[PDB]
Amino acid sequence: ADELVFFVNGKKVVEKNADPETTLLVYLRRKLGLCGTKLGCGEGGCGACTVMISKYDRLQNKIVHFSVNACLAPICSLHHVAVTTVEGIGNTQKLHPVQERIARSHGSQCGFCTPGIVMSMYTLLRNQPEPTVEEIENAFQGNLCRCTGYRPILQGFRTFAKPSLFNPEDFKPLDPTQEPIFPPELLRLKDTPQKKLRFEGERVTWIQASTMEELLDLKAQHPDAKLVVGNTEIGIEMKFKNMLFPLIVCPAWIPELNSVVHGPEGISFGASCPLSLVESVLAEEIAKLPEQKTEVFRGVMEQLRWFAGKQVKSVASIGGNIITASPISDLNPVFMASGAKLTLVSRGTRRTVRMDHTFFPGYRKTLLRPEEILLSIEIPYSKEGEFFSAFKQASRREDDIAKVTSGMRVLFKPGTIEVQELSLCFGGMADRTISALKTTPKQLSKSWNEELLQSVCAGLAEELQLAPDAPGGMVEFRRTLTLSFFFKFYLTVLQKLGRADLEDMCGKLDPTFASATLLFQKDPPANVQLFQEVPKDQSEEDMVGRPLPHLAANMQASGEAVYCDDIPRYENELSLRLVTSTRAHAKITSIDTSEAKKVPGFVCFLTAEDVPNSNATGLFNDETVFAKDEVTCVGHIIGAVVADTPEHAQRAARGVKITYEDLPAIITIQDAINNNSFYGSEIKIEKGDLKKGFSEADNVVSGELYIGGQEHFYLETNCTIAVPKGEAGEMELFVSTQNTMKTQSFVAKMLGVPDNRIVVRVKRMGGGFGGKETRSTVVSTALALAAHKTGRPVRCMLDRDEDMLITGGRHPFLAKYKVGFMKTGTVVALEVAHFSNGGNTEDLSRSIMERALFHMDNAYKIPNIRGTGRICKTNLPSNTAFRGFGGPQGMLIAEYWMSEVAITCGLPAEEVRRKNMYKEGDLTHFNQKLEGFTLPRCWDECIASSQYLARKREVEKFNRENCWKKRGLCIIPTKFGISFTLPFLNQGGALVHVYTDGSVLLTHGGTEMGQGLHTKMVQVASRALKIPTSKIHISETSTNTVPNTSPTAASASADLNGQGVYEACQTILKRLEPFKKKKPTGPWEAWVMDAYTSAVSLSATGFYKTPNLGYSFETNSGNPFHYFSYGVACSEVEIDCLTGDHKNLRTDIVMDVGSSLNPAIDIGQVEGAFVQGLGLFTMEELHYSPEGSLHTRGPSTYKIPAFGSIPIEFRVSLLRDCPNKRAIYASKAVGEPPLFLASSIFFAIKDAIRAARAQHQLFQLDSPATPEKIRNACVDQFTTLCVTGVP
Amino acid sequence: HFYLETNCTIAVPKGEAGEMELFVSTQNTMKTQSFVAKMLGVPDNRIVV
Ligand SMILES: Cc1cc2nc3c(=O)[nH]c(=O)nc-3n(C[C@H](O)[C@H](O)[C@H](O)COP(=O)(O)OP(=O)(O)OC[C@H]3O[C@@H](n4cnc5c(N)ncnc54)[C@H](O)[C@@H]3O)c2cc1C
Ligand SMILES: O=c1[nH]c(=O)c2[nH]c(=O)[nH]c2[nH]1
Ligand code: FES
Ligand code: FES
């Protein structure tokens, strides 16, 4: 047959024309309208699309439940399953316990990741109603959150395992009998045989094979037929590498491919067995068998720990990993090292082979005949005297791709330490899984000793060569890991020989080496959140300073919260796809749309010619709407395809052929320096006498620092819907933007209509972080144009790869410093030259450099100082605002030379920082006076609560007692100036209505992006009006309610909009006063109705401007900032000197947020900002080709912090008794200032590296301090052999 | 009356907090809002006409 039949939230779906290219995510959202399930990446790395599948498993004979990525699940694989989405488990009328707890524990900020995380936790509970803490963490290996810093999610969910921010005693208990029935029809159908099915789409035919005979017959007659089991590789090939397999066969149903059989030599798994099943089977075997027999099983398990997450492992098959034959397979090295036995079949044939180097003859090839399939793999029992290790080092532990991965096996002659067999196999060192076949033969009959160690390392260094040009780079690191992994195996086998009672023959392990061989384990988290209770006397209805949950948290947990692309399509709505430059700098010689036009549903291709009025856009009017004559970066938008559906728009975009003639490209900061290519002139702040300071200085240190940029990775990408109204040029846009005003202005200028025709509406964003302050408009303008031209609504949401390529990021910085200082650590002179890479338009680049210069002091009084900045103009995507806006880059440079001062003086870093710190009343280098300077309080509190001094003693002891792991510890302060650097942007407006039922509709210029701005404004309005928050509502942000709004940026939006709201409320109260006087007790509703029937206006605007701002670079005078934020963080790390991996052991933060408007939201901002900083300085790296093409375009390669990344002990205190009388209700801004405090981790790492270097001098550590950079800096016997040589 | 356009309403539920937006051929936005809000039992502030 040919109908596809499945269930969704208990409702039967019958699809009569299933297309094999249709994903479950698209089917749920676009066909069924269930938009709780989100698109975050389309490549399995984010979990935002997580749903649960239930089925009756014929082989285990029972109902099973597992999680999947809907973005990679073909609907054609789902016949006779039952899907559950976030909508299926609960809603705001009756929240599931999972939904309730994540909301109430402040686990949801922007909300875009919340459904997927809910479904991960929900699936766990359906499988294990009483999970462990570890099981809970493990449920989320495949889920990302960019806002929360993960802490609150795990803390809320810990309640399921085994003053306060939330109260777990009010959480309703779980009743598992109340979960949805497994669809009774499906149980009835488990008693009918499966028949073969065929589904035909636009391009692809899918056969769901029911028997082995059908599969073999098919592959005999049609060897082209592409096997799909999990689709976790094929889905990537199709979506990202434009590969089309017109015939697909799915064999998942076939019993022989799903069998597990225990044999004498090992356990045989059907090739279609999911990795989840391999894991559960091997775990039971390992628990029950002798250790001597499970060495290989434990190797596989160790790799599967770090293999994707639960969603991928539920459907990814063991045979699929093998045949995919990726160079970076984590399993094939283990299978090759252990000689695992593979059975291959075709119609009428059967052969068995042992995986060895022959199995993989070439890039992504096996020795399978085209008509052959893999039936089974036998993973072997280990023998007496046979030992096994497996290793993986990546950029991040959880859900990442191996840089190097390995399986290692040794067999000893019985009763000896003499080698009978030795196998070292590697991924990530060639275009296939390889064996070190030259090195290992030579060690046969040798004893396991130092000479074998040295011989194998010399062999590996020669045998596993990498060309300077090898894909992925990091050749020194990768080579170093092969030797380092072998060292670990060498030491591990010594220990294993030990436990076999042969310690006399091979050494005992030196106890300072034992930590080298430990398998990773973190430890259960311990968290502390400290904040100040409001006064005893405060009304219970006054929520200012109380930890009120985000007003939309319940709806976010339930998937009812509406983001742009969740808005239903009009019946006549069209889809837009942007077409971008594949050259960094080139002339457009021609455009050929001939193939585009043949795609069904194609409407038109828009280019510069179609722009009605002006093609000049961007904040400084130096950008094109659409390229004209030349392209100036890879990612430069040339045009936009308009089609009926996003699929057809994508296909048509591929048929737009562009011909180019290259022009000289300027890529790097050095390129731009050499070509004098800059945005405007040098910016400079200077004070005192540099000549004099350097002459007075006992010591002078010079150096440079490079700081990599950063992708925002808002979980919701850029999105616009433009709705033309058909009259008078009127158009309404629904946009994920922090900047309604510029969106409106830019659309209006492009169309050539007045601003009064264009309305921009923002309900909420799934994150922004500065990325949607300006760069959102490159989508909005294109969609507006399409809508105008067609007279039809048009929509575009970027795919993650498009968004990462087009919209830019944080500015990379290169700095050259020279610092003068006394032997006491007192700094007397500093000169810093900053360079940033701005890319191909000015955008905010100059203002970012100004803030970096304003923060080049960090917390330190420096009497003689000079900083300069230059913004490089390059052929790269334009970089823009990212939370911190140049602050983090400025301050990291300051801390970097400060670290070298302390080292050079031989004084404790904390004493050097402390004695250079500003004091109350000092002037900054830009002559602003520091009043209400709480930094010393933050410092003293942090030093004391973190027990910094005693912890220094423990770090020193650890470092003396361990050779191959080291700890480091650092405490870092910060000062962060609050207000836009452009004075007039420090303004905000509100509009309030009171309706005659007493209910209040509030709006302001600020946009909700997960920071809890609307929540705070409601708290504010409720205090100002003296009514419960329940009577006040904010529905959205719009240009036609509050005009001329600044972007929601500069951490200032609650300050500005708070005042605006407060003033609007004061006007209403003034009007109600006479009614209050006449009816002093009679309720609010009676005053309102009395005012109304007296014809008194119940609508008011409110407005605020920050007073007394305006700095001059010419005179180094005037205040850029209204006040400053302050905080301190102390962090401890433990590095792996052999791999570059590290654990974040503990972080303690004390943050001055004034009198917090909402301590729950403010702690959440501290934690979220801190963890983005942690990413910036230690994990997140973008790579570009020499020709300026971004390689890094999804979560597979761009590694943001994961649940497993965060400090194990994570303590956050908000400073007590520090009212800030010049912001709303004595609060301070919080969004950006905490981010730089994650430098504490960077400097703790730097400390640990210094200890490692003393073990095996102002060494260079650039940002980010990734495993590559950490490992490479830990110079030893192994790095020496890999960088050039001398054996 | 024989208005050439008869009575007509489009009601668009927003799925959040009882929020609803109505496109109406009416001389009386206020009473439309009131009457909808009262029928549903939500505050006036959720209902836009
Ligand atoms: C987010 C993410 C993270 C990942 N992480 C990792 C990781 O850490 N390590 C790792 O090694 N991989 C990783 N992968 C790769 C992928 O998950 C594995 O390769 C998985 O095992 C592929 O299995 P599948 O059943 O989904 O294969 P499919 O995609 O269905 O098929 C893959 C290939 O195998 C073929 N095939 C399948 N079964 C057979 C058979 N019996 N005989 C012949 N050919 C067959 C198909 O024709 C196809 O060529 C990751 C993928 C994703 C999306
Ligand atoms: O001074 C600032 N101006 C901005 O426009 C902005 N944007 C941002 O994210 N931070 C800041 N800071
Ligand atoms: S959208 Fe499916 S994993 Fe990201
Ligand atoms: S709350 Fe998790 S991505 Fe925003």
Q: Would strands A602-606 and A758-762 be described as parallel, antiparallel, or unpaired?
A: unpaired
- Residues of chain A with Cβ-Cβ distance to B30 below 8 Å are 996
Q: Which atom of ligand 4 is nearest to the CA of A715?
A: 3
- CB distance A1004 to A1018 below 8 Å: no
Q: Which of A930, A965, A993 delimits the end of a domain? A: A930
- Out of A144, A233, A1200, mutate this one to test ligand 1's pocket (max ligand atoms within 8 Å of CB): namely A233
Bond from prior residue into A724 cis (ω within 30 degrees of 0)? no
Residues A104 and A133 in one domain: yes
Beta strands in A447-601 (DSSP E): 526-530, 574-580, 586-592
Nearest 5 degrees, angle CA A1086-CA A1090-CA A1095? 150
CB environment A26-41: b (16+ within 10 A), e (fewer): bbbbbebebbbbbbbb
- State the DSSP code for A853: H
CATH of the domain at A800: 3.30.365.10
User: Tokens 């917090």 identify what position?
Assistant: A1156
Contact between A875 and A665 (Cβ < 8 Å): yes
Q: Are A1004 and A989 in contact (CB under 8 A)?
A: yes
From the list A514, A833, A873, A894, the residue with the least C-alpha distance to A673 is A873
Give the residue among A715, A882, A802, A709 at the shortest CA–CA distance from A144: A715
Torsion of CA A68, A69, A70, A74, to 10 degrees: -80
Q: Is A147 annotated as a binding residue?
A: yes
Q: Which method, experimentally, gave rise to this model?
A: X-ray
Say how far residue A297 (Cα) sits from the centre of its chain.
32
Which residues in A lie closer than 8 A to residue B37 (C-beta atoms)?
997
Which residue, of A382, A408, A428, is where some domain finishes? Answer: A382
DSSP annotation string for A394-405: -SSSSS---SEE
CB-based contact B17 A1031, cutoff 8 Å: no
CB–CB of B45 and A1033 under 8 A? yes
Tell me whether A417 touches chain B (CB under 8 Å): no
Q: Which residues share a beta bridge with A923? A: A929
Q: Are A973 and A934 in contact (CB under 8 A)?
A: no
Q: A560 contacts in B (CB within 8 Å)? A: 15-16
Which residues, judged by CB distance below 6 Å to any ligand atom, belong to the binding site of ligand 2?
A 770, 773, 844, 847, 851, 881, 883, 885, 980-981, 1049-1050, 1232
* Phi, psi dihedral angles at A1185 (to 5 degrees): -60, 165
CB A1262 within 8 A of CB A708: yes
Say yes or no: A905 contacts chain B, CB-CB below 8 A.
no
Residue nearest atom 41 of ligand 1, based on CA coordinates: A374
Cα angle value A810/A813/A816 (rounded, 5°): 165
List residues of A with catalytic annotation.
1232
A247-250 and A226-227: which strand pairing?
A: parallel
A1182 and A1116 within one domain? yes
A1204: tokens are: 């497993």
Last residue of some domain: A913, A930, A947? Answer: A930
Substitution target in A87, A991, A999 with the highest count of B β-carbons within 10 Å is A999
Residue A227 touches partner B, C-beta closer than 8 Å:
no
CB contact under 8 A, B45 and A999: yes
Place of tokens 């520090």: A1218
Domain count, chain A: 10
Resolution in A: 1.9
Check if A555 contacts B (Cβ < 8 Å). yes
**DSSP per-residue letters across A175-230:** -GGGSPPP-HHHHHHTTS----EEEE-SS-EEEE--SHHHHHHHHHH-TTPEE-SS
Spatial contact of A381 and A265, defined as CB atoms under 8 Å apart: yes
Position A907, amino acid: L
**Interface residue A1000 vs chain B (CB under 8 A):** yes
Give Cβ neighbours of residue A501 (< 8 Å, ≥ 6 apart). Answer: none
Q: After which residues is chain A broken (C to N over 2.5 A)?
A: 162, 1256
Q: Which ligand is nearest to the CA of A46?
A: 3
List the binding residues of B for Mo-molybdopterin. Answer: 27
CB distance A916 to A858 below 8 Å: no
> Can you list the positions of beta strands (E) in A42-136?
50-57, 62-69, 82-84
Cα–Cα distance for residue pair A446/A452, rounded to 1 Å:
7
Cβ neighbours of B19 in A, within 8 Å: 1035
CB proximity A561 to B under 8 Å: yes
Q: Ligand nearest A271 Cα, by number?
A: 1
Residues 1028-1067 of A with CB under 8 A from B: 1031-1033, 1035
Determine how many CB atoms are found less than 10 A away from the CB of residue B21: 14
Contact assignment for A1033 to B37 by CB distance below 8 Å? no
Q: What is the CATH number of the domain that holds A105?
A: 1.10.150.120
| CA separation for the pair A379, A268 (Å, rounded) | 6
What are the chain A neighbours of B17 within 8 Å (beta carbons)?
A: 555, 1033, 1035
- Domain limits for position A166: 89-190
Ligand 1, atom 7, residue with closest C-alpha: A307
In angstroms, the separation between the Cα of residue B4 and the nearest Cα of chain A is 21
Instruction: Give the residues surrounding ligand 4 with Cβ less than 6 Å away.
Output: A 108-113, 145-148, 715, 767, 1010
- Does residue A180 share a domain with residue A294? no
Looking at the fold, whether A243 and A365 belong to one and the same domain comes out as: no
Which atom of ligand 2 approaches the CA of A980 most closely?
A: 1
State whether A1165 and A1281 are in the same domain: yes
- Tell me the helix, strand and coil percentages in chain A, rounded to 5: 35, 25, 45
Tokens standing for A574?
């069209």
CB B22 within 8 A of CB B9: yes
Q: How many A from CA of A780 to the centre of ligand 1?
A: 37
CA angle A288-A290-A293, nearest 5°? 110
What pairing do the DSSP bridges indicate for beta strands A349-354 and A373-380?
unpaired
Instruction: Verify whether the Cβ–Cβ distance A1035 to B48 is below 8 Å.
Output: yes
Q: Are A907 and A824 contained in the same domain?
A: yes
Which alpha helices (H) appear in A128-175, and where do they start and end?
Answer: 133-138, 151-158
Phi, psi of A743 (to 5 degrees): -60, -45
CA distance readout (Å), A207 to A7, A483, A965: 20, 47, 53
Q: Which of B14, B37, B46 sits opposite A562 (nearest CB)?
A: B14
* CA angle, A803 then A808 then A814, to 5°: 150
Task: Specify whether the CB–CB gap between A870 and A905 falls below 8 A.
Answer: no
Answer for the pair A417, A505: CB distance below 8 angstroms, yes or no: yes
How big is the CA angle at A790 (ends A787 and A796), to the nearest 5 degrees?
Answer: 40
A769 and A908 inside one domain: no
Asked whether the beta carbons of A261 and A281 are under 8 A apart, the reply is: no
The strand pairing partners of A249, in sequence order, are A207, A227
**Residues A1118 and A1203 both lie in one domain:** yes
The verdict on A225 and A352 lying in the same domain is: no
Same structural domain, A14 and A46: yes
Residue A362, phi-psi category: left (phi > 0), alpha (psi -120 to 50), beta (remainder): left
B16:A1031 CB<8 A? no
Measuring CA to CA, how many Å separate A359 from each of A95, A347, A482, A539? Answer: 52, 21, 22, 74
Residues A852 and A736 placed together within one structural domain of the fold:
no
CATH number of residue A448's parent domain: 3.30.390.50
CA distance A1191 to chain B (A): 40
Distance CA A829, CA A1061 (A): 46
Q: Which of B33, B44, B46 to mutate to test the interface with A (most CBs of A within 10 A)?
A: B44
Same domain, residue pair A1119 and A1083: no
Residue A231 per-residue DSSP state: -
